[model samples]
Target chain A: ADFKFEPMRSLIYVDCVSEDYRPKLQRWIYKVHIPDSISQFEPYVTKYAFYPSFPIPPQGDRFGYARMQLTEHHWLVSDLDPRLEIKAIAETFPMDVLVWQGQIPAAAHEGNPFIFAFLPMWWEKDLKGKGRTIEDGANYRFNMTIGFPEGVDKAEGEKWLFEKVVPILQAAPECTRVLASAVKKDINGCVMDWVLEIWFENQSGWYKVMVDDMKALEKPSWAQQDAFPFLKPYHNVCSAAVADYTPSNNLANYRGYITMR
Target chain B: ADFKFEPMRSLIYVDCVSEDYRPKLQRWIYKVHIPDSISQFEPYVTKYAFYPSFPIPPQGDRFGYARMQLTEHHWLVSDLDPRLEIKAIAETFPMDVLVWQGQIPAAAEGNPFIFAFLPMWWEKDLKGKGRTIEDGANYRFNMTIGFPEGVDKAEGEKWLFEKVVPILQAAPECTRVLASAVKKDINGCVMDWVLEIWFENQSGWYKVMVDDMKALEKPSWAQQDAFPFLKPYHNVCSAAVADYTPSNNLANYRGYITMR
Candidate 1:
C-alpha cells in the first residue's frame, strides 16, 4: 500500500449541440471562446481540465467536460461564485436570433471515476528529445473506450489496456506519442466504462490502425470468442494541445517509466 | 435621414485554433462547446448570434463570434457576478493535460468593417430569369483592381466603368458581373475598384472566360490608351457554395464552401 494519492476535487459537465455545427462552431469553442474564458477564470481554477467528446473521427455527436478543482464544491454553484452572476445577467439580453446556449451547475456526480493508463514507450523519446516540448508531435488524440462484459474486473481491464491492447497499438506505424493512456471509470453514464487516450500521427494514421490495419494485427482469442469483447471504441483525430491559459509547465514526464533521448 | 438604425450591444470574438485542428476541433467547438456555453449564459444574454467562418477553405486560421446583449456591461466583468465565483472556485483541480480556451470581455471591436456592394444590373436578369437567390449561383469569383496615378477622378472612374468594366461583363461565359462602378472615396491612392464575377458552371467555365479575355486581339479604348489609368486585376479567389439550395434561414448553409 505504498501508492500515494491525490484528491481531484470538482468535475464539471458541459454538453454541446449536434455535430452539424461542426468545424466552425467547434473551432470557436476550443480556440477563441474557451481560451478567453479560461484565462479569466484562472485565478479561481487551479487545475483546468477539459475533454472533447468524440474528439476523434470528425463525425457524430460532440460533448465534453471542463473538469476543474476548487477549494470547496459549494463555492462553485453557490451565490459566492462571480461567474454565476455573469451568466445571470447575460441571460436577460434581448435577441432576434438564437445561435447558441448553455446549462451550468452540471458538476460531475462521481469523484475520480476515470483511471487513465499509459504505455510510455512510444513517447519516452519525444519527452526526452532535446528542445522538444509536449506540443511537438502530431496534433491528434486517439482514444479507445472498451467495456467489460459480465465478469471482467478493474484489474483485468487495466491489464488488457497495457499488456494486450497497448502492445498491438505500439507496433502500429501510425502511433506517435502517448499523450494519455488510462482506463477512466465512466462515472458518467454517457462515456464508456474504460477509455484509453493516445496520440497518433495524422488522420490517415487513425484510419489505418482502426480500420485497415486492425484486420491484420494479432487479436486475442478472447476477442474472437468474446472473452474481452470491447464495446465500440470511440476514435477520432483531435488537437492534443492546451488552451493558451491552461498552464502546462509539468506536461512532460522525465521519471518513473523510461526515457531515451 | 430616414435610415433607422438599431443598437447592437454585445460583441463576441472567437478565434479558432490552427489549421491542424480542422474539421476535428472545428466540429467540437461549433457543435458542442460553444452551444452549451451559450445556453448556460442565455438567462443574461439577448440575441446570441454567431457564424462559422469560411469552413470550406481548409488551410488557414479559423474563428467565429457570438454577439449577445447583457442586462448591463458591468455584470459581465463585475466582482458581483456569480459566474465569476464559479470560475474562481473551479481553478484549483490538478491535471496533466489541457486544451484551448476563450473570453467574453474581449468582444469584437470592429463593426460592419466590410462593405460588400452588389450592383443590381449584373445580377438582375440572372436574378429575374429564375426564382433565383444569392444561393442560386453555383460559381463565384472575388477580385480587386487599382487605378493609375494623376487622372481626373470622376472622368477616369466613369470611363473605366463604361469602357473597361462593360467589356469584361459582356463576355459570354459569365452569368453576372458585380462591378464596383464607383470607387469608395478613400481619398487615398491605395484602393482602386473591386469586382465579383459569377458563372453558372464551375471552374471549367471560369477558366474559359479568363483564356478568352486574354486572347482578345482588338484592344478596347481603355487598353489602347498608351498610359491607361487601369491597373491589372487580381482574382482573389474562387468558390462553390457548400450547399447551393434555397433556405430562408439566412445563416443555415449546413454545407461547407469548397475552395479551388
Candidate 2:
C-alpha cells in the first residue's frame, strides 16, 4: 500500500506584544497581511492555519510569554529551504513580533521532501486506510510534542506512529487530522523531537475522544509511554489546547472578531 | 426488577491535629479501635473503609483543612437515628479530630432505609443488571457528588440513575461498582444532591473509563452538563483521584506499610 505525509509547515510563533496590541496586530495580519502574503506563500505554502493563545490555562502552562499566536504555512515545496520564505511572510509586520519560528517537515519528508508525499494531507483528506476526512475549520488541536531521547528505537517508533497511532486516529470521527512532525534536520533549528498533531472541532472534542478512548484502548509499552509522558523523566511533553484564527475556508468566524483600526 | 444500594455509610471527617500524630492515631484506630468497634458496629456497620488525605493536587481544591482522614461506617440498619451510634464509634479517637461527618443514605434509600436494599453491595456483587461484581479491595474511587439546586426532575433523575447510569457502568469491566448516594432525609444531614461513586483498580482506571468514555458517549443536555461543569457554573466538580486504606480483606495492600 502507498503511504503519505502532511505538507512541511512554515511555522510562525509571533508575540502579539500585548492583549491591547493583539487585536490591532492580528487584525492587520489576518485582514491585511495574509491577503498580501498568500501570493508569495501560496505555491510553496499549500494551506494556512493559525492558532492564537488564550488565557484558558488547560492546554499548557508557563511558556514564558503570553498573548502568542501560531501560524502554519503548510509547504508543498520542502526540498527548497523555507527560512527565506518564512521570513518574508511575517517580515511586513508593523512591529517586530517574533518570539521564535521554525519549519517542521513531515516525519517522512525529512531527507527527500516528498519521499512518500501525496497531494492531500493524510489526515485532512485521507487516501489511506479508511479514506475518511473531517472539516478543515476544526480549530481546536490537542497537540502532543514528544522529545525522543537517546536509546529510543526509531524503527519501533515509526511502526508505532504509522501502524498504531495513524489507524486509531483515522477512525476517530472527531479527529479531522493526525499529523506527525519530525525530521533529522528542521529549518531554523527546531526540536529534534517528534510532534503528533490531532485536531478536533473544539476542546470538548479533545476531552471526549482522546481522553475517554484512552480509558480502555489497548495498551502496549510504547502506547503507555505515549499516554503518560510524566513517567518518562528523560522525555518531555506539552499537550492539549489550541484555537484557530481565520481557521476555515470562509474565515468569517475568527475574522469577524477583528476590529481593525 | 430488583435493585440494590450500597449500605448507608456513617461518614467521618477527622483532623489528625498534626502529622506527628496521624501515624499513631490511625495505627491505634485500625489495629485497636476498629477490632473493638466492630462488635457494636457490625450488623449495623457491615463494612469499614478509611481514606487518609494525601497532599495530591488533582483530587479536590482546598476545603478549609489539611491532614484529615475520612472513615465510612457502611451501615445495614438505618431506621434508627445514627448520630448517637456515630458519636460512640469515634468517641475513642486519640484526638477530637472532628472536621465534620454525616451519613449519606443511598439515593434510592432516602425516606425508607431499605426501599430496594439487596444484601450484596450493588457494585461489589452483581444483581439486577449484569450480575457482575469487582474485587472488594479495588480501593480507588472516582466520586462525583452533585448538588441539585432546584427545579430538577426526580423521575428523570431516577430514570438516569438506574436505567441510564446503572447499565452503562455495569458493562464497564473496569468498574467494580457503580452506586449513587442520596435521599430526602439522611443522618446528621448530607448534600441533598446526588453522588456517583465509581470504584476502579487505580487512577488509570478512572482516566480510562470516565474520561475517555465521555468523549463519544451519547449526549443530551443533562449529559453535556455532566461533562462541562465549568460551563454550567452552578454544578460543582472535584474528581480524578482517591485511594483507600485497609482497602482489601488481605489488608497488606495498605496495611503492610504500617511500620508499627
Candidate 3:
C-alpha cells in the first residue's frame, strides 16, 4: 500500500503566454516530464507525449478565464480535434494545455492547487423508496428542464452544454474509474445515455458562474441573490436529450458528475 | 472500426500444459491466430510478446489445480526468495500458475493464439451502470461475493483465497460492468470491498454453499430447461478467479505517486 500514482488520464492545463510558450511548454513536457516520467515508469508507463495545437474555447464573458482542458483521451491522440480537443486555441492565446498521462498528482501534493470542483447534483424525487425496480413493475422516467435565466443567449451557452456540461453528465473518473469510455452506451445506438439532472449546486460559488433557463442573467449567484453580476437575469436553460431519457431513478446512468476544474 | 488486439499487460497466464503438448499448442498459436490478428492491427502493436508459460491448468488436478485465488497482494517478492519462484512454487500444488512475456510472431501469417490460449480469460464485466450521480446519490461503490462450490475443504479455500481472490477483486474490467469491484477510499479507509462468494448453481435447485453474504443463483429455468451446462450464477455466485492475478495490483506502489 505504499504510495503509487493511480493510473489516470491527466488533463494538463498550461496557462497560455505566447507562440513561443508552445515549444517551451512542449520542451518542458518532452524534455522534462516525458523522459522523466517514462524513466520513472520504465515498465508501467504506457504512453506519453505533448499536444502542441491543444485548443481551449473561450468560456466567454460570462464565466472563468481562457483555460485549456485535458483528459486522457486528449493526451492519447496528441491532437486538438475539435470534438475531443483542448479548450485553448491559437498561438496568440498564451495558455497551452497538455494532458500528461497518469493520475492527477495526489491531493497531498502542495506544489500546485488541484483546482477541484464537485457539484453534488441530486435529483429530488416525489417518492423515495417507492420506485419500481427494473426487474419488476412500473418505473419512473426522469425528465429535465434546465432553466437558464433571462438574457444569456441560448446559442452561446451551448458550449457549456457539450464541453463543461456534458462531462458533468458523462461522469468521468467515476464511470471512467472502471468502465472504458466507449462502453457508456445504452440499449439504443447512442453511446452515453445519462439521466436528467434535476438539481445542481455549483459549489464552486462565483467560480462556477452559471446562467439560468430564462436567459435572464449570466452570473453565478443571480438566481439566488439580488446584486447579481453581468447580464442581469440570465438563465441558461437546458433539457436532457430526449433519446437519453431513462425510466430508472437509480441514477446508475449519469445521475450527476464531478469535474476537477 | 477494425478489430484491435492490444496487449493489456506484458504478462501472460502460464497454463500447466504437459511439456509434451507444448509444441502442438505453440504451433497452433503461431500458425493460425497471430497472423490474422495482425492483419487488422495498424502501425504496430505498442507492446506485444509471448506469454512464457500460460494456459488453463490441465484437468485431473495432476499438477495441483489451485485456481489463482485472490489475496491481499500479488507481487510478493517474499514468495520469490530462497530459490523458489512465484510461478514455480505455486506450481508445487498441482495447480501452478505464472505470467510470461513472449514476442509477437515475426510472420503475420502465423496465428498468435498458437502461442497462447485461443480465447483466454479476457476479463470484462457483464453488468453495467453502477455510478452515483447528482440527480440521485451515486455512491460509486461496488462489491462482489464469490462462491466456488468446487472447494470442499475450508483450509484449501483459505489458501486459494489468500493466493488468488485479490486478483479477482482487483479486476477493473469486472468492476467496470459489474460495479462491484470498484475500490474507493472513504475517510482514510478503502470502501466498496469485494466479498468472498462460495456458492455454485447447477442442475435446477438452489444448492446451499459456503461463506456467503450474498449469492446470485442462476434462475432454475436456465439449469434444466435452458442451458443445462451454463454456470447458473452471477459473479456473486458464478464468477471465477484467474489462475493468477496481474503483477501490478499486487506490487508495491512506486515513488512518483508520493512525490507527485
| Candidate whose DockQ is highest | 1
Q: Residue-wise lDDT of candidate 2 within A112-200, one digit each (tens)?
A: 11111112233332323233222223245544545444466866665655675566666777777666656424433433355556666
lDDT of 1 at B140: 38
Supply the TM-score for candidate 1: 0.35
- What DockQ does each listed candidate score? 0.03, 0.01, 0.02
Q: Sort by DockQ, best first.
A: 1, 3, 2
Residue-level lDDT tens digits of model 3 in B203-222? 10112122220133333222
Stretches off by above 4 angstroms in model 1 are A1-44, A47-138, A143-152, A179-195, A217-230, A233-261, B1-54, B57-260
| Clash statistics: count for each candidate | 81, 9, 102
Off by over 4 Å in 3: A1-61, A70-261, B1-16, B20-24, B36-260
Error of 3 at A7 (Å): 25
Error of 3 at B70 (Å): 17
TM-score of 3: 0.24
Tens digits of lDDT, candidate 1, A1-261: 232222222322222322222322333333344445443443443333343332324321221221111011111222223334564212222111012112222233511122222121222222112343434532345433344544546577557656655665678756654423332233224233433444554556655565555555455433423122323221111112112111111111111111000
RMSD of each: 18.7, 24.7, 22.3
DockQ of 3: 0.02
Q: Write the per-residue lDDT of candidate 3 for residues A63-105, one digit (tens) a residue.
A: 2111222211212221222222111111221122322211123
Whole-model alpha-carbon lDDT for candidate 2: 0.39
